[PDB]
């Protein structure tokens, strides 16, 4: 009779055996390795960019300029707003006062 | 022995009760030995033997008294399990109308009461028997419990028909000893009875048959219901895995690109 | 212990039968009673050694032929009304006597049915050899007669066994069906359990890399 | 552990399915965003005497090289910086050490020339 599994036990078993655990685990290991690579190979350049005085907030979707001493700062958004040349020009102009 | 036998009031009362039982049950008419008999406060040995014989034959008819009952009274009482047997010496049995009659008088009373209770007991037995002769058909006619709950039914049927056959055997044998060789009456009584049997058990058959055909249906409904469930899991499980793997495949590629761009030094 | 003196006693060549049934000799009597599944019937015990065990033998006989239980009838003999008034635990004065006499009465009616008219207490508690053999002879004659009446009743037996057979076959079908299905549910539940444990294991090992 | 309880498992799985997806969000590319904003890449030097090359502009518009270990700290530059400027920067690195300052001054200087 159709709409009736011909052998359900064998089907469940066939699903269990195809459920490759170590494959996805190994994938996770590969991913953590990649993350550590990005960290190590980004450390210095990030230290330089932060040394300029620019810091990022991808949470608030905005960036911050803290080269203005005396409790003042600047902010810039990353929505689909204006061109990149504009952004760059503003960030650089407000940096080396 | 534990009884106020010598107390004159006690004696008077048990005398009254004895007299009442014997007179009510037509003792004097059935045996003219003492006739119109009334309070032998001073008994005669003859008469005492008469009374004892009457009462005991009422307890155990078919007993065969010898020609000197005095020689049997003690053994009769021992068989009856007379509780006060120890308080009696065989010697006193020969002439009880003397000083020790207070004991034998008591004995007589004890028999009267015993008789009272026997006729009562046996009555119940009769009733009980009637009850048994139907119990089976009643219990087998109660609402049918599923196989696991109703055990020992085949024994009930076997017993029922066994009792029918026993009735046929007993009555037909009565005829046989009476020199009647035709048992059609008994046989008829059997057939009638057996028909009742064939009826009730037939019900069972039908019942069971129906249940069988229903069970099939039920199972076919559950099986489907179950396989669906299985299918369900095998479905979403699959999806689940797929989805997870997707999440991984994307990630690894993404980070890959990132690393590549972190290493492009054109 | 081993008694054959009764054999050396004078045995008249003439005879006189007062009963309607034949009087069987000791050995044949024992053979017939044993063939009726009364294992307790032996030449040794149904001779002068006729003792208290006769109560047991008569109980077995009546219970087998009348198809009733003596203990049951005695139980129903001793109870008028017991929910409230309890004047029964103390009156030992009559209980034993009454059980004894009731047994004697059951035997009495049974033997009345099979051609003995004077069964009495002696036959149960002061039993004698010759009279015991007379009573048991009545028993045997009735047994033979019955064995002949069975052939008249074989038809009923066969029909019965047929119907009971039907019921049992059907119930066997039921039991087989539900057993099979229960097995299926068992196997499936097993594999599913392995799959659940597998998935849970997968999620546990993975979560070690999340967090 | 009965198939009837599979509902329960569908919960955990739906959570796992979720949790995994949340941890693997693409959010490790800070460096590239920085470079795109500032239009400043840090590259190897064209001559390994000067190891570090800073590059301003999307094209190879401006750039300057630094060999902080040798005896020629300030190396090449395509915008053709004059001696005075080169000494200025070499002191913004040798004495000051403010690398940010060096980058702002170098950018202002290089973007002035062609
Ligand atoms: Mg024979």
Swiss-Prot record, chain A:
One Pfam short name: Spc24
Classification via Gene3D superfamilies: 3.30.160.430
CDD domains the record matches: RWD_Spc24
Subcellular location: Nucleus; Chromosome, Centromere, Kinetochore
Note: Present with 1750 molecules/cell in log phase SD medium.
Function field: Acts as a component of the essential kinetochore-associated NDC80 complex, which is involved in chromosome segregation and spindle checkpoint activity.
Subunit-level organization: Component of the NDC80 complex, which consists of TID3/NDC80, NUF2, SPC24 and SPC25. The NDC80 complex is formed by two subcomplexes, TID3/NDC80-NUF2 and SPC24-SPC25, which are joined end-to-end through their coiled-coil domains. It has a rod-like structure with a length of 570 Angstroms and globular domains at either end. The TID3/NDC80-NUF2 globular domains are probably directed to microtubules, the SPC24-SPC25 globular domains to the centromere. Can also interact with MPS2.
Similarity comment text for this entry: Belongs to the SPC24 family.
Stated name of the protein: Kinetochore protein SPC24
Lineage of the species this protein comes from: Eukaryota, Fungi, Dikarya, Ascomycota, Saccharomycotina
Swiss-Prot record, chain B:
Modified residues (Phosphothreonine): 134
Disulfide bridge partners, by residue number: none
Effect upon mutating residue 87 to A: Loss of function
Compartment(s) where it occurs, according to its Swiss-Prot or TrEMBL record: Nucleus; Chromosome, Centromere, Kinetochore
Subunit composition and interactions: Component of the NDC80 complex, which consists of NDC80, NUF2, SPC24 and SPC25. The NDC80 complex is formed by two subcomplexes, NDC80-NUF2 and SPC24-SPC25, which are joined end-to-end through their coiled-coil domains. It has a rod-like structure with a length of 570 Angstroms and globular domains at either end. The NDC80-NUF2 globular domains are probably directed to microtubules, the SPC24-SPC25 globular domains to the centromere. NDC80 probably interacts with SMC1 and SMC2. Also interacts with KIN3. Interacts with DMC1.
Note: Present with 1160 molecules/cell in log phase SD medium.
Family, similarity comment: Belongs to the NDC80/HEC1 family.
Function: Acts as a component of the essential kinetochore-associated NDC80 complex, which is involved in chromosome segregation and spindle checkpoint activity.
Listed name of the protein: Kinetochore protein NDC80
Species for this entry: Saccharomyces cerevisiae (strain ATCC 204508 / S288c) (Baker's yeast)
Lineage of origin: Eukaryota, Fungi, Dikarya, Ascomycota, Saccharomycotina
Gene for this chain: NDC80
From Swiss-Prot, chain C:
This protein's record includes keyword Cell cycle: yes
Any one GO molecular function term: protein-containing complex binding
Keyword Cell cycle attached: yes
Gene Ontology cellular-component terms listed: condensed chromosome, centromeric region; kinetochore; Ndc80 complex; nucleus; outer kinetochore; spindle microtubule; spindle pole body
Substitution effect: residue 170 to S: Temperature-sensitive
Cellular compartments annotated: Nucleus; Chromosome, Centromere, Kinetochore
Impact upon substituting residue 206 to L: Temperature-sensitive
Swiss-Prot/TrEMBL keywords: Cell cycle, Cell division, Centromere, Chromosome, Coiled coil, Kinetochore, Mitosis, Nucleus
Pfam family, one: Nuf2
Highest taxon listed in the record's lineage: Eukaryota
Coiled coil: 167-192
InterPro entries: Kinetochore_Nuf2_N, Nuf2_N_sf
One of the GO BP terms on file: cell division
Family: Belongs to the NUF2 family.
Subunit-structure text: Component of the NDC80 complex, which consists of TID3/NDC80, NUF2, SPC24 and SPC25. The NDC80 complex is formed by two subcomplexes, TID3/NDC80-NUF2 and SPC24-SPC25, which are joined end-to-end through their coiled-coil domains. It has a rod-like structure with a length of 570 Angstroms and globular domains at either end. The TID3/NDC80-NUF2 globular domains are probably directed to microtubules, the SPC24-SPC25 globular domains to the centromere.
Miscellaneous: Present with 1550 molecules/cell in log phase SD medium.
Function: Acts as a component of the essential kinetochore-associated NDC80 complex, which is involved in chromosome segregation and spindle checkpoint activity.
PANTHER family: KINETOCHORE PROTEIN NUF2, MEMBRALIN/KINETOCHORE PROTEIN NUF2
Protein name: Kinetochore protein NUF2
Gene it is expressed from: NUF2
Swiss-Prot record, chain D:
GO terms under cellular component: kinetochore; Ndc80 complex; nucleus; outer kinetochore
Modification N-acetylalanine occurs at: 1
Subcellular location: Nucleus; Chromosome, Centromere, Kinetochore
Gene Ontology terms describing biological process: cell division; centromere clustering; chromosome segregation
Domain of life: Eukaryota
Keywords tagged on the record: Acetylation, Cell cycle, Cell division, Centromere, Chromosome, Coiled coil, Kinetochore, Mitosis, Nucleus
Entries under Gene3D superfamilies matching the protein: Chromosome segregation protein Spc25
Function: Acts as a component of the essential kinetochore-associated NDC80 complex, which is involved in chromosome segregation and spindle checkpoint activity.
Record's miscellaneous remark: Present with 3280 molecules/cell in log phase SD medium.
Subunit structure: Component of the NDC80 complex, which consists of TID3/NDC80, NUF2, SPC24 and SPC25. The NDC80 complex is formed by two subcomplexes, TID3/NDC80-NUF2 and SPC24-SPC25, which are joined end-to-end through their coiled-coil domains. It has a rod-like structure with a length of 570 Angstroms and globular domains at either end. The TID3/NDC80-NUF2 globular domains are probably directed to microtubules, the SPC24-SPC25 globular domains to the centromere.
Membership in a protein family: Belongs to the SPC25 family.
Protein name: Kinetochore protein SPC25
Organism of this sequence: Saccharomyces cerevisiae (strain ATCC 204508 / S288c)
